[PDB]
Design a protein around this ligand. Structure first.
Ligand SMILES: *P(=O)(O)OC[C@H]1O[C@@H](n2cnc3c(N)ncnc32)[C@H](O)[C@@H]1O
Ligand SMILES: [Zn+2]
Length: 581
């Protein structure tokens, strides 16, 4: 095969093998075989040896197996340079920007105005086929695989220049950014302060499977190798965005034409209105001269172009003192921290109570009490302490310390892992979760108990904990909330049938500290009865499979809890089987 042909196949092989490694270990819907997949991975290595030049440590071959094809974060120089934009914060400067451009033709020049997203990335394509995709700077990290987890990014193009380098951004939508931040808070990890960083991390994952469960989307706006001077007949910035879309590239961020600094400013304000109506955090707009041909004459500065500019929304950050900190208790039992700030003004709305997330965040940022703090809006939606103003410390700041007891039940607290929490099985703060967990198919299957009925039974006062479900024997109780006997009797038998699930499913229902779906069964077989387990010694618990010293000494305490004993007894009496099924 000719030198060129080998290159082409080598790109295609590296692709299909990356595609199917995704189609397999990530999506789980493979098309080709598990053995017919190795027929390509071996040929990749064959051409990679009779043409050693094309050896790229990005190739699948450098770390193979039946393991997830991880992305090599090796530094890579982009064909063309990826510049950054200069920042304007007033119409005076935007006007001055157009004035700077007046060193040639007339007065009001036409532009294309689009919104500002988060997370810069470049994607190099050869003969339409995709080679790599990197991060940013001057040299960027290779992360092709993690970019495959975003279904919108196209692999094969058509009618494109031999060497195409399309740019754009990979971002995480607010909803997702918020979902991720919640999972992190509960686990006791440090949360992200914005979508840029969260998109960064979610893309800087060894296991591309992780990147997939994160929101991650991508939008594309600019070209490089391939723009006009190469093969594309693109003349307008507006045509480019449509061109990009047509070729299968996802252009989701907003854009529209505008005449002169005056008209640019018209789009700006119309944008500033919708500053928090977009599915993503946009901190400004980007006005670019629409005539591509005029981009050549107009160069770049040391670190920025001349034909384009970034008009930014006002920075909504304010300084204030953290007066006191109060504690709340989540649905899962986790004692959450809340800082009571000196009333300040961010975007008109008055901020006075801000979240401190968890003990880690408080520790990282070194958040104390008498402290002055800079508070901002993460994702431009959730107020939080961006960082403390250290130097202004009077020395009398008090360090944030958790309470001995749970503020919502009085039970002594316990630090399970990285976050403080309430062990009390009957804590009122944990009722809804307790009931649901117990009703799920994995636990004691009780289908009728929808997420709504549980809170209705809780609100009305008919249920305080798990055992009370069995005392609802009276359908007279169930015949008032959207149910009318036809729906009542059907659930009455479910609460009844659930009595019969064994110790295995029963231990998993009462959610003990750490006792998983498997840890419950291995625990139930080894004890036979709830009574026996309640008399377990520390040793007997450790001797069990998967039970660590840390989880043994935990189960041991919950077992002796006068409240756990109570809940168990009241469930026994209702006739719930305490044995192994
Ligand atoms: P902002 O001051 O937050 O800077 C964001 C950087 O990312 C690039 N960028 C974001 N969004 C776009 C669009 N829509 N078009 C072109 N470039 C964008 C810029 O290079 C900013 O420097
Ligand atoms: Zn409690």
């Amino acid at each position: 095969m000719t030198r060129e042909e080998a290159r082409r196949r080598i790109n295609e092989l590296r692709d299909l093998i990356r595609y199917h490694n995704y189609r397999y270990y990530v999506l789980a819907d493979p098309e080709i075989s598990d053995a017919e997949y190795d027929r390509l991975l071996r040929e990749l290595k064959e051409l990679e040896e009779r043409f050693p030049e094309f050896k790229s440590p990005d190739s699948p071959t450098e770390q193979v197996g039946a393991r997830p094809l991880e992305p090599t974060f090796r530094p890579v120089r982009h064909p063309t340079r990826m510049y950054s934009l200069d920042n304007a914060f007033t119409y005076e400067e935007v006007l001055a920007f157009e004035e700077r451009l007046e060193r040639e033709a007339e007065a009001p020049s036409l532009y294309t105005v689009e919104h500002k997203v988060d997370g810069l990335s470049v994607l190099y394509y050869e003969e339409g086929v995709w080679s790599t995709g990197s991060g940013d700077g001057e040299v960027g990290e290779e992360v092709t695989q993690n970019l495959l987890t975003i279904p919108t990014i196209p692999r094969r193009l058509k009618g494109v220049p031999d060497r195409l380098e399309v740019r754009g951004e990979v971002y995480m939508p607010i909803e997702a950014f918020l979902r991720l931040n919640e999972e992190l808070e509960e686990r006791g990890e440090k949360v992200f302060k914005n979508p840029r960083n969260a998109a960064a991390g979610s893309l800087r994952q060894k296991d591309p499977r992780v990147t997939a469960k994160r929101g991650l989307r991508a939008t594309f706006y600019a070209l490089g190798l391939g723009l006009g001077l190469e093969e594309s007949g693109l003349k307008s910035q507006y045509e480019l965005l449509l061109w990009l879309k047509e070729k299968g590239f996802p252009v989701e961020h907003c854009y529209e034409k505008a005449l002169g600094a005056e008209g640019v400013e018209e789009v700006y304000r119309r944008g500033l209105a919708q500053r928090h109506a977009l599915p993503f955090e946009a901190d400004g707009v980007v006005l670019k001269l629409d005539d591509l041909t005029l981009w050549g004459e107009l160069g770049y500065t040391a670190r920025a172009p001349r034909f384009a500019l970034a008009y930014k929304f006002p920075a909504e950050e304010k300084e204030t003192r953290l007066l006191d900190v109060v504690f709340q208790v989540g649905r899962t039992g986790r004692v959450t921290p809340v800082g009571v700030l000196e009333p300040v003004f961010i975007e008109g709305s008055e901020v006075s109570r801000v979240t401190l997330h968890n003990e880690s965040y408080i520790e990282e940022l070194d958040i104390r009490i008498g402290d002055w703090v800079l508070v901002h809006k993460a994702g431009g939606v959730i107020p939080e302490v961006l960082r403390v103003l250290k130097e202004r410390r009077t020395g009398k700041e008090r360090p944030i310390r958790w309470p001995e007891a749970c503020p919502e039940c009085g039970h002594r607290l316990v630090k399970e892992g990285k976050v403080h929490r309430c062990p009390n099985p009957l804590c009122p703060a944990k009722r809804f979760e307790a009931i649901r967990h117990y009703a799920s198919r994995k636990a004691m299957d009780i289908e009728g108990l929808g997420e709504k009925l549980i809170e209705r039974l809780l609100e009305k006062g008919l249920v305080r904990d798990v055992a009370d479900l069995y005392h609802l024997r009276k359908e007279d109780l169930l015949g008032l909330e959207r149910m009318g006997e036809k729906s009542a009797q059907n659930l009455l038998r479910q609460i009844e049938e659930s009595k019969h699930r064994g110790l295995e499913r029963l231990l998993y229902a009462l959610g003990l500290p750490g006792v998983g779906e498997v840890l419950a069964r291995n625990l139930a077989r080894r004890f036979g009865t709830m009574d026996r387990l309640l008399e377990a010694s520390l040793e007997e618990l450790i001797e069990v499979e998967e039970v660590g010293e840390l989880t043994a000494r935990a189960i041991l305490e919950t077992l002796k809890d006068p409240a756990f004993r109570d809940l168990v007894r009241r469930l026994k009496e209702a006739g719930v089987s305490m044995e192994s099924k």
